[PDB]
């Protein structure tokens, strides 16, 4: 964006031209704009002026209402008013760049509506150019009707007639268009149009049609107004539609896909193409140049689709060297050479683009390169003197382009190309210099140059090819070629960058450092030229302010210095030093992208000292001047804040204060547009370029000290925005790279700064705290100077914490370095930055509490580019930050201000944050072994941290402050836990304890829990699904933080295990723990405020829910914490002094003072056992040192040892306390309020239990005791209640769920199963206890069904409850009777329940025959729209398999694992807990089978009804609507439904055979008919009646797919006949709908979609399967093929494509699809020797165990009874044609159709003799007499389609051409492929062969190049094996004759002449053809020689005449510089003669 601003104002003198002018002189100004004499203008320095005309025209369109519309006609007055601006925008964007930026569309569309057709001409061409750069790189559906509308006004050609015709006098107008006919009727006789004016005739038609129509009829009647005149305006009117046309032409084609296009607009208007290459010609003056200009332009739009650009060249004779298109070339180069006003360099530029468009595809590159396109642009080239540079740097870059490859680079070279450029380059540079006075310069512009811009481009063109050119062949080109006067030219560009502008010096320098950098050894010329010696002592005046000379200097320095002497020079005239002072300008640092291209360049230069070290010593030298020198340019640019018009203050001070609301941008950019900002920017990126390499800028430490480096990153008074600019993004890298490589180079330095910065802000910090120091302030100067500190710091603090000090990179020397810090200069630091977090916080609250609410939003400082937002300072919202709230309106000067703000003191106190983390964390990260010296400083640094967060909490009263508060809160939490969950720094909070700060947050939590008792109302307070500013929820919050951090700081599993205090103290009685004790007085605390609270009555006792649940929440799991046990008994704990930290700092310091050293007194300490001398019996104490230290060791002497703490809160704090408080609350508590407390709180129920689990657990008071109250309390509880039932019921559940109970609570279990029984009822279904009941229920039932455990006998768990039999069944009997379920997790419940019910067969049988599916089925329908139906879904989807798994299925299935387990000696034990599920789904069975196999080590020795509902239910959603989404593919509740029925279908029906039987005999009417016969109704639906909608319909379609094809496939366990009926049947319904819908072929346009499907379906059944059913086989695929190819579905599939028409649109993607299905027939017959998650039923089994026996050894259970049976024993013991002759008739269509899969199908079709010979025969007929006419062409057709179903017209697009290349490609392919096939041929028409020949004589084929090659390679294949069978038919003159005709064919290129060549050798082995082959070429030679010596005649005379100045005719040349010239035939004769007489 800082870019466009520069540009635009460097721009500004243009802008204040065209808008300072009033309209009328504004228009005649446009109007002067004509010729563009400087590059093209970014449209955006244009916006302004757009603007205006925009608003301009709206006017005119408000004046006639064209915004229905009336057919009124605009005034001439209005008309050229309007044309003026129209051709103006139409010449700007033509002339510029970036045209996305306009955005005055909208005011052309409504322009359209003008019925006068000037107008609409201007429009469509304005349009028409809008538009192509959506298709290099506008949805209204009017617009595109209306375009297309007018593109098909008029027709092309009618009869032939065409409107190219209109301009000459041979021949008469239609009759059709002299008449008005309309329909919609309308009609005007001939004379009716004279009379009547055109708004008459407007009128008149308005009155009788209605207004959709009027549009039209404006075009039809002006056509009929315009054509019905026999002279005069009407002409001119007619060449206006006509240009209208075109212009409309070439936009359809933009926004229409091809397919559209050719659908849309080709088809009605087949004769567009010829039309428009009919008008281009130059050559004919009397076309209207507009028209003709119109024309060119829509073959260029066109051109850009590629599709038609074929096409288009067949029109031109682009492929033949005297076609229409070189015609047009010749007439340009004429033109040029005559200077005649004819010249139009607009149109040949247009001509030179769509060339290159068309080159652009390779066979048309091909095509126009052997037509001889690079001879006629180097005629054109070639011109001298010529004035019209446009044109030549046109056809120059075109001939760029074209250049690519090594031939066509050796066609320019050896036609002397490269001479005549250099000539060229030289004599334009001479002449340019040596004429000034043509110099005319842009105005309006910034330029470097003084040429007219006309041969800057031209030069330009000219280096760039040069550059192209040498960088193709260098060897050459660069040394023997360039030995021309190209050198001094060179030299002069570069002694005249003045004249010759930036551009022309890069590219001169370009080609210099490319010559000399290939082939050195040049570079004493160079040297000899003055070339290098220039550039060497004028270095500085090249640089310039160019981005690709600035990345290309490092290049040419390295090239220079390539030389030894160049070095030197290099090193002498320190270029260096200019390499990188120009980056302290500003304009030059711009210039370099402060992104790659400036990484680049720095990597250039690090890589120019990698080659050369000798320069490294300046290189870096370099670098420390420019770092020096650059603080020198830092200025104050500008301001960043800006007092508010109306006050003169800043910032806002009321909350209802209305708002400027201006018109700025919402959020200032300011440091992109400073100066420093992009020096810096640049600068920075430069250096990490430099510093990635790890090179020479590794050595910058050394001569640059870090102060220096520092200096210019934080720079004094930056932007707010500087601590986000990429400048601070590249410093961090080049700082953390130099602190990998130098540790101590930096941090002591920044750490200074830092320091020494906020210690500047001392006035800031040491504010008053009860008051905004800012607003406080507000309207002073002092304001902004504390703002660019502020701004300042927040760098300083963003560099520290990303690059020095993070928990990543804490590494053991950083780690050192910050103890060295805090030792050496103290720790101000620590205390500075905790006024810094407190006034940030402190401000933050106080702006929020004065801005109108509406701006709190919109200066949101959290969207930062790098934040993440996680972690403090907590963002207090107003609205619901996740909805749409994005902020950008209402801006303002106070709004940004505060924006400014609010982000640095954000920014600020998130570093602040994350410092104090890493202070309080240091060296506990890497755990390094520390010394006493610095373990002490460690502890000293974490007390000073600890007090300063407590002095910050203490400071503040709770009151009228919480949103400060939680910030506080917040930030507490962050500070003194790790990241990971978090877990509390132990030692930091020990310290936190020992000071008193727990008793704080004690505190804080009971006024928190005071005040929420006066909150109204609590319900509110659940709905918290963000922080908003309200009272309520911000005590909420800060409650919610206290009490999670008094849970965080209580378990040992979250606080960091420290060692025990050992470590620290040696005169202690007990070494307790750390972490293990301070857990004890938090609990003694945390339980007496809980106990404090239920005195109060406000906790327990209570009678409402008078707490929020997440508060409950936590305190319950402090209850649960409270209760737990950790093995520590303390009975006082130490305070944690870093004096007394052994050994004791504070009596060493007295040592000292006393004289004693350090040392010597820590060695006497250590010895002493910390004890002080008593008296001076040591002798250590000289005399006066026992006198001073008895003076100053002082009275008391328990300063010197660790004192222990002091009780906090209550009494005491030692564990004894906190076991006698346990027992105080164990009687009185909770144990027995839990029932009293419960059912105010259902949804913490569980957590209710993990508490009280606890509770007994530690106090070990029978657990079953209390489950037994609780079954009491549920039986004495009436149902009437089931809020309070249903929750009893949940706990009980809970409690029953540990073994513990479990084990004890049998009598429990029964009594709760009696209870059940007796109560429970299926009227209940729908209450919320009975699922609970049922959760009850399903713990006992899953252990009930655990297998029996038998006894033993000989050889080498605990137990379970078993439910009563008679309970068991009279529980299932409820279950069924279930009534109609409204419940959803009552559905649930049952559903699981009867998951286990269903194991036995007979339990399933009856779930079946109840219908309880059907209900649960309803109920998925029901709540389709929660989230949690997935999982009664798959509940579901597990119960009705077990529903149709019979006892066989079941055995055959347990026998395949068990076979599989084997296979894949085992022990039992890894056996059955690998197929434990298998195990649990039959215990029984899979004994026996396991005791039938096996012999703890093992030796590897009928209609259930179901699927009729699932069907039923299926297709009644089907008719419901399943394709609409919902207001604002599972989203559409009927979508999920049905795809959820189709997944569950298919594992039904590809799992089961009584699945697959039910879907055969589905009946839709429920007829109840015994053994039901086979119905097609399921098959049926599923075939016919089956953007969101386009992918609905996709995965419905594969879900229906993959159903069919699982029906079809075989069942998870030769020919079953089962089976093999059931895929007969389905085939054979397949066959069935495929013969109806193809029937005629206006149903297969009806029906298309249906076959596609039903094509697609047998595609996939053959072929492997659908998509799906992959998780769930060969003997499939051969069963399937052989049933298909038995049934005769080939013959369907032919006949099908028989029927087609292929004229309509989709008929032609049938055919696709059907020879795809016959091609996957053809291969699936590889069997030549015989010729969305889904899961199989054991993943389901296994899916099931998980559900309830999530444990894996349940299986280990069963072990006992295999033991009674195996061990107890054993250890006692031990082709044909695939198509019928006629289907092959319907496969030839495929060459009628404008690949790979035909290419397949006809060589699997070969295989079979029959087939191979009708194929071929077929094949050749077409090519015999099939190519020869359009009419043969279509009786070919005709025939073909008449054999095929046993007159038709021919598509539209096809034509010769294309089916003889279709035909040709496939018939060389298989002759290629197979071997066999050419035999054919080879075995005079009888001979198939000699059909190929006679296409030789056939000018359709001779002349075109592609079918000409293939033609050859062919004929070559067969030549060389007839030669080769006879060596080891016969040929006649003709046919000799025919062959060498190729070589006299234009289109014989190299490859044809070289397969001609091989062909003619190859007939030559054959007798009798060497003579008949040299007679005949010595007849042609000699025909050619006469025309050759005529020609050199006249070439001689006419070289004798020129006497200078004039140039050879172009007729002349074009005999000799063509390819298809005489003596290139010749040449090829004499090749050809050499090679017949020289091969052998």
Known sequence: KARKEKLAAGYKPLVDYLIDCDTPTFLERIEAIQEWDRSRDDLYVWIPILDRMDGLLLKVAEKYKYKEVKLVEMEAHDVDYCLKMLKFTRRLLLNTENRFVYSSGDVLMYLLNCPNFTIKLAVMRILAILGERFVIAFGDHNLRKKTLKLALSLSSSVMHFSLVDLYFDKKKVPQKWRKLRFTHKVTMTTQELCEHSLQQIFDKGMALLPAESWFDFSIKASVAKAFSDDSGENIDLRNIIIETKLNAIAFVNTIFSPPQVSSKLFELDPYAFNSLTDLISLSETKIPKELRTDALFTLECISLKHVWCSDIIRNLGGNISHGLLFQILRYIAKTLREATDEIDEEYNVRFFYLISNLADVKP????????????????????????????????????????????????????????????????????????????????????????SFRELAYIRSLLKLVLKLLSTDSGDRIRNLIDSPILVSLKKILENKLVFGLTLITYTLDVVQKVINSEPTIYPVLVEAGLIPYVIDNFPKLIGPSAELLSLLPDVVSAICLNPEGLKQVKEKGLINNLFDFLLDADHARILTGGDRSTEYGTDIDELARHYPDLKANIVEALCNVIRKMPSTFRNEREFLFTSPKDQKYFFHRKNEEILTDKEEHEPAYWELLDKGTMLDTFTSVLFGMSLGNGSFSQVPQHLEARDFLAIIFMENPPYEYFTSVAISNVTEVLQYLDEKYEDYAFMDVMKVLNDQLENLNDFLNSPNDRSFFLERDGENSVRSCHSKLCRLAAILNIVTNVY??????????????????????????????????????????????????????????????????????????????????????????????????????????????????????????????????????????????????????????????????????????????????????????????????????????????????????????????IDESNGILTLSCLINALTFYNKSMQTETMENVQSIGKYYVSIDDDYNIMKALTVPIKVMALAMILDLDKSDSLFKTQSRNVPYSVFKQLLSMLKNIFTNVNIYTKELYELHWDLIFPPIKKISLFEQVGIPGDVAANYLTDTGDDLPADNSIGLFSPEQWEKYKKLIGEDKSIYYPQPMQAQYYKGCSSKELDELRDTFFNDGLPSRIFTVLPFYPKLVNAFAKTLLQIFTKYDEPTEVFAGRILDRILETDLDDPATLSSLIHLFGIFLNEKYIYQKASHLMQRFIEYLEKSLKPEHVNTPWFSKALYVYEIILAKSELPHLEELSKDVMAKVFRIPDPMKQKLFDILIRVSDISNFYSALATSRILIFYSRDELYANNIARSGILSRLLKVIGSFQKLDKINFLESSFLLLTRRCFETTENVDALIRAEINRSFTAVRELTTILEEKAHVVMRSPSQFIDVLCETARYSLKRFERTGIMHLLLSQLMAASEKDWLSEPANPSRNPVCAYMIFLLKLLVELVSSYNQCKFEFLTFSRRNTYAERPRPRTTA??????????????????????????????????????????????????????????????????????????????????????????????????????????????????????????????????????????????????????????????????????????????????????????????????????????????????????????????????????????????????????????????????YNIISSRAMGVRQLPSDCTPLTVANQTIEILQSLIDADSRLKYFLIAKLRWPLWHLFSLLDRKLITDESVLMDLLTRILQVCTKTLAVLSTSPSFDEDDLMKILSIIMLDSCTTRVFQQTLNIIYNLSKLQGCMSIFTKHLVSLAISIMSKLKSALDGLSREVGTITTGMEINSELLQKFTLPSSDQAKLLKILTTVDFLYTHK
Request: hydrophobic residues 40%.
């Open 364 to 451: 048309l590159h091909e095509s126009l390169f052997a037509a001889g396109l690079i001879p006629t642009l180097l005629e054109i080239v070639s011109i001298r003197n010529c004035p019209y540079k446009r044109t030549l740097a046109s056809a120059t870059h075109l001939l760029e382009t074209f250049i690519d490859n090594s031939e066509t680079t050796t066609e320019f070279i050896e036609n002397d190309g490269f001479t005549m450029l250099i000539t060229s380059v030289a004599n334009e540079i001479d002449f340019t210099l040596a004429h000034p006075e043509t110099w005319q310069p842009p105005k309006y512009s910034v330029v470097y140059y003084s040429i």
């Open 1579 to 1836: 098959i049926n639906f599923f075939l016919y009646r089956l953007k969101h909608e386009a992918k609905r319909r996709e995965v419905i379609g594969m879900l229906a797919r993959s159903v069919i094809i699982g029906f079809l496939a075989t069942v998870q366990d030769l020919a079953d006949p089962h089976m093999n009926f059931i895929r007969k049947f389905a085939i054979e319904a397949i066959i069935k709908a495929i013969r109806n819908a193809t029937s005629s072929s206006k149903l297969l346009e009806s029906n298309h979609l249906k076959l596609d499907m039903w094509f697609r379906i047998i595609t996939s059944m053959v072929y492997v399967q659908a998509p799906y059913l992959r998780q769930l086989v060969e003997a499939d695929q051969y069963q399937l093929c052989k049933l298909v190819i038995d049934l005769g579905l080939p013959s369907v599939i032919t006949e099908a494509m028989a029927s087609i028409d292929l004229n309509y649109p989709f008929s032609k993607k049938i055919f696709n699809v059907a020879v795809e299905a016959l091609n996957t027939i053809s291969s699936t017959r590889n069997n030549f020797s015989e010729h969305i998650i889904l899961k199989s039923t054991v993943s389901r089994w296994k899916d099931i165990f998980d559900m309830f026996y999530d444990s894996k050894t349940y299986a280990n259970c069963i072990i006992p009874t295999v033991i009674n049976r195996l061990y107890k024993v054993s250890l006692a013991l031990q082709f044909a044609p695939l198509i019928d002759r006629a289907g092959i008739a319907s496969l030839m269509k495929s060459v009628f159709i404008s690949r790979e899969i035909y290419h397949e199908l006809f060589y699997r079709l070969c295989s079979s003799k029959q087939n191979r010979n009708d194929l071929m025969n077929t094949f050749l007929f077409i090519l015999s007499e099939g190519i020869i006419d359009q009419h043969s062409l279509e009786k070919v």
């Open 805 to 1026: 000090i993070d928990l990543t990179t804490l590494s053991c020397k950083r780690i050192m370095q910050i103890y060295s810090y805090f030792d050496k200069r103290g720790f101000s630091l620590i205390k500075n930055l905790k006024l810094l977090f407190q006034k940030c916080a402190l401000e933050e609250m106080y702006i929020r509490q004065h801005m109108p609410d509406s701006v709190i939003t919109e200066t949101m400082p959290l969207p930062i580019v790098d934040v993440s937002g996680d972690g403090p300072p907590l963002q207090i919202y107003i609205d619901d930050p996740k909805k749409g709230d994005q902020k950008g309106k209402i801006t303002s000067v106070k709004t940004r201000n505060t924006l400014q703000m609010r982000t640095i003191l954000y920014t600020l106190q998130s570093n602040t944050a994350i410092l104090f983390r890493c202070f309080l964390r240091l060296s506990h990260s890497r755990n390094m072994d520390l010394e006493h010296k610095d373990l002490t400083t460690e502890v000293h640094i974490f007390e000073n941290v600890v007090e300063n967060v407590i002095e910050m909490l203490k400071a503040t009263e709770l009151e009228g402050h919480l949103p400060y508060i939680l910030v506080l809160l917040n930030f507490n939490t962050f500070v003194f836990t790790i990241p990971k969950t978090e877990i509390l720094q132990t030692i930091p909070a020990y310290i936190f304890y020992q000071k008193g700060g727990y008793l704080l947050y004690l505190h804080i939590i009971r006024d928190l829990f005071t005040r929420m008792t006066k909150i109204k109302d609590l319900s509110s307070l659940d709905n918290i699904n963000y």
